[PDB]
Design a binder for this molecule. Structure first.
Ligand SMILES: [Zn+2]
Ligand SMILES: [Zn+2]
Ligand SMILES: [Zn+2]
Ligand SMILES: [Zn+2]
Lengths: 413, 416
């Protein structure tokens, strides 16, 4: 709904301004880089650069970035996913200059020293060690994508394999950074109470001078997942866990597909909200699961509709899967009430306008669509969403929720 | 009883192994082993080790493309090649009179092979055909490939040496030149000569053609570091293919690396379970119940963490799950320790006969040495026969219960 103005610099750095209205803004730097741009053996680098991006540059010390942003009362965070690496500072419009100055300092001026690479690697090694190896939901998450994808880089989670992390080199990281953190592969997004013309010329002051690597184009990943040809399963026995978990995922179209809208709605009906089907049946009523939810991941390439449930003590994961399937079979039968379709539709209207208030929520929307160049899909989202009928939620259900596209993972003691 | 040998390492790190056979006349085999396979590849650039097999018979400094074969055939020789997970292997079958020319031809392709773009481009289309025909559109081939995709997740054994189609499709000449010049160094190669020929003649002739060949640099060949995590439970995958009509099954159990002590028992287990016309899979699945048209086992002795593999293709109107239910029932029967003394004895008497039959053929002896040389495990090879004949039933049952657990099982169904 909100209007936007975009301009492209001579180096390829796309600048996008979204005027919003109380001085509060968020300045984003997006990199069209994810773990999907990695290769098995040298994975996890996409996430490693997130840690390294806040290290010493030419004019900044090893922690000077996080200290300068703290000085004008701003907040800074960063995240790397499958398809995008995103940095952002949320502050007032008064600090729009220094924020752009800071981000430019880390783009075309960032140097990765050895005495910074070594200490940070063993840190990420611990992040792998304690958030995937010795973590219930984390291990299930990683092992699922190991099973659901065989060839495409979605074979692994942005954290990457442990041995990969252990065998990184400074050269490997510099090559990955220099190639993928080029101005041509980046986007500057500013959202909040700021002037679009003011943002453009001020972005030019810090980014027009920065240059790219060569003239060649960014290497495009070619590892396309072959169509899934039947159910894949994997059971994971791991000491350290006590409860029994299960992940059920169905193969789902790429980002720009028309059916992604109905899927998003299916997620909010099945396992998203205090009144979802999973929460009501498995958690509330039958009390089989302590936690149960769904998430229609909107990955750039061939994505996946994900179910995750961690049952109560002494409850097998085969019972969880059997009951989730039971719900899905009731779904494919067309058992959706008008009230359910209505409640999800009115809750979407509510959640939408609530996000238009905060600049941080708005920038999150565009960021996911800017990197895909599907802004037209963003603007037409609500109109296509509210015009959804039960027929649409059932067509999509019977379309992608087949066992032949299913990937099931059991987590047992 | 195993043939004595003499080894010599050249100044460039090339190993030369001569295995004379007096009880043979004229016939020899000239082997060139490269310590390279699909295990030295990376996903995105897989199947390259196999591509090099095709390109190895193209033009060199002195030879035109295919002139290698023409020359070999001219002196009535036979030259085959094969790439596996761990080892790339070339050999010429001929007489000792052609030992010199054979060594010349192999030196001609080792440190003198030029990889022209006009040779790489058409040959890739060929190996692209080899992929679609014998994997993308082949029952046993697709099953073989999809199995290793499931059984292994991280280690390069995730794929068979044919590689992924898109990998093949996205190769570059630079990629292949990098791979070849790195992995086909003399320091990474072994020249093996078996048959009726003098060792000192083998050495001086190999020194003649290979001693002057240079390496790429001084730093050692990169060792793969992607070790497969211990399998933490059963893994399954169903493959629906249009071309198929009968249902197939692949049941594999994780197994120790090449140089392990239990490998001999594993070999013995395969001899008992699914090899020969007297195996359990034959006279129970194929014969007594007529459930499968084909059924066999293979203890793959891969360099890194290996796999014991059961493969069965059912008769019409027989589901793949029915095949799995039966082979498991055999394994449970096996794990109960139900092996007759008569059964164990038949395995040992057949192993004797095959061994003495192999000592008569230079081709057989070469094949034995080739696998153990690339692993530097000749001691294991010599000690094999005695270890095999000292196997008790208990050894077979211990090894069975040790590795044939569902938590290390990988199962792939081929439908419809
Ligand atoms: Zn992190
Ligand atoms: Zn989304
Ligand atoms: Zn071939
Ligand atoms: Zn063997």
């Amino acid at each position: 709904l909100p209007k936007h103005e975009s301009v492209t610099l001579k180096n390829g750095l796309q600048v996008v301004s979204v005027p919003l209205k109380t001085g509060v803004i968020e300045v984003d730097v997006l990199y069209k880089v994810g773990s999907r741009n990695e290769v098995m053996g040298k994975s996890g680098i996409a996430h490693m650069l997130e840690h390294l991006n806040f290290k010493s540059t030419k004019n900044l010390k090893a922690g000077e970035f996080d200290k300068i942003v703290k000085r004008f009362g701003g907040v800074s965070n960063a995240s790397t996913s499958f398809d995008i690496t995103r940095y952002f500072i949320k502050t007032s419009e008064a600090n729009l200059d220094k924020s752009l100055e800071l981000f430019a300092e880390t783009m075309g001026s960032l140097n990765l020293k050895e005495d910074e690479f070594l200490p940070e690697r063993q840190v990420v090694a611990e992040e792998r060690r304690w958030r995937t190896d010795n973590s219930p939901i984390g291990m299930l998450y990683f092992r699922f994508f190991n099973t659901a994808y065989v060839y495409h880089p979605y074979h692994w989670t942005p954290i990457g394999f442990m041995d990969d992390i252990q065998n990184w080199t400074l050269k490997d990281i510099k090559k990955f950074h220099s190639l993928y953190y080029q101005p041509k592969n980046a986007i500057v997004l500013v959202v909040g109470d700021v002037n679009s013309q003011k943002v453009f010329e001020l972005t030019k002051k810090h980014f027009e001078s920065l240059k790219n690597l060569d003239e060649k184009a960014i290497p495009t990943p070619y590892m396309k997942e072959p169509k899934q040809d039947g159910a894949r399963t994997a059971v994971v026995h791991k000491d350290g866990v006590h409860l029994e978990w299960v992940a059920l995922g169905y193969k789902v179209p790429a980002f720009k597909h028309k059916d992604q809208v109905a899927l998003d709605a299916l997620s909010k009906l099945l396992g998203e909200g205090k009144s979802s089907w999973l929460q009501s049946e498995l958690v509330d009523k039958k009390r089989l699961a302590s936690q149960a939810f769904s998430h229609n991941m909107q990955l750039q390439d061939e994505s996946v509709f994900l179910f995750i449930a961690g049952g109560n003590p002494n409850i097998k994961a085969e019972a969880l899967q059997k009951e989730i399937v039971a719900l899905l079979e009731k779904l494919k039968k067309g058992e959706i009430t008008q009230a359910e379709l209505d409640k999800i539709k009115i809750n979407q209207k509510a959640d939408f306008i609530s996000n238009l208030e905060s600049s941080s929520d708005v920038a999150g929307l565009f960021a996911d669509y800017l990197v895909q160049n599907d802004l037209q899909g963003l603007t037409d989202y609500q109109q296509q969403f509210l015009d959804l009928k039960v027929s649409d939620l059932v067509r999509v259900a019977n379309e992608y929720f087949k066992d032949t596209q299913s990937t099931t993972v059991f987590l047992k003691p």
